[PDB]
């Protein structure tokens, strides 16, 4: 009703971990209008881990472009600065058509060109790349977006009431929270 339970139980994954994409209509709106996962921070208790990642699947050569850059956000702790101009980027200008296009979104908000560049080619980026797809591959991750709690529940919006938006995202977050009490 409120969530599934996988037939194939992960272990290792972190407490909550959620999947994305920046080409991805119901994830601009669960980011940018619905604020999911700032509500699930809130409503959860002062240590638990929240992982993000992005996903290959959509957007053509695109797709693993913005995988590679929202490792390299990863990796430089600036998930906070450009989320928001990504997805304007792609969605709303549509102005980003290219690698240099997701990099000059970076340099916008404040990192240096230099490190945005070395980032982008360290290997700790590349195990950042590896990492989010192993991620996906482990719940063979179908569609975006997607929300697990703890490698054995997966958030189902479809029984959610989308008629209100602050019931929606009240009763999301609340999910949440009585999953990874369980």
């Given amino acids: 009703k409120q969530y599934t339970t996988l037939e194939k139980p ?3 994954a972190p407490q909550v971990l959620e999947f994305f994409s920046f080409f991805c209509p119901h994830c601009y709106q669960f980011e940018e209008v619905l604020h999911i996962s700032d509500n699930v921070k809130k409503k959860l208790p002062e240590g638990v881990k929240m992982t993000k990642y992005h996903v290959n699947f ?3 050569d ?3 472009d913005l995988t590679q850059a929202w490792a390299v956000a990863m990796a430089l702790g600036v998930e ?3 989320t928001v101009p990504l997805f ?3 969605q709303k200008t549509q102005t980003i058509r290219s690698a240099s296009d997701i990099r000059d979104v970076f340099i916008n908000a404040g990192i240096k060109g230099e490190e945005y560049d070395a980032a982008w080619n360290s290997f700790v980026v590349k ?3 590896a990492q989010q797809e192993k991620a996906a591959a482990d719940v063979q991750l179908r569609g975006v977006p997607a929300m697990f709690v703890n490698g054995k529940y997966q958030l189902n919006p479809q029984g959610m009431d989308t008629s209100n938006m602050d019931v929606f995202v009240q009763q999301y977050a609340d999910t949440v929270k009585y999953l990874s009490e369980k």
């Fill in 88 to 90: 304007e980027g792609v």
């Fill in 127 to 129: 195990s950042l790349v």
């Fill in 62 to 64: 695109l797709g693993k």
């Fill in 10 to 12: 992960v272990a290792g």
């Fill in 58 to 60: 959509m957007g053509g």
């Fill in 80 to 82: 906070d600065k450009v």
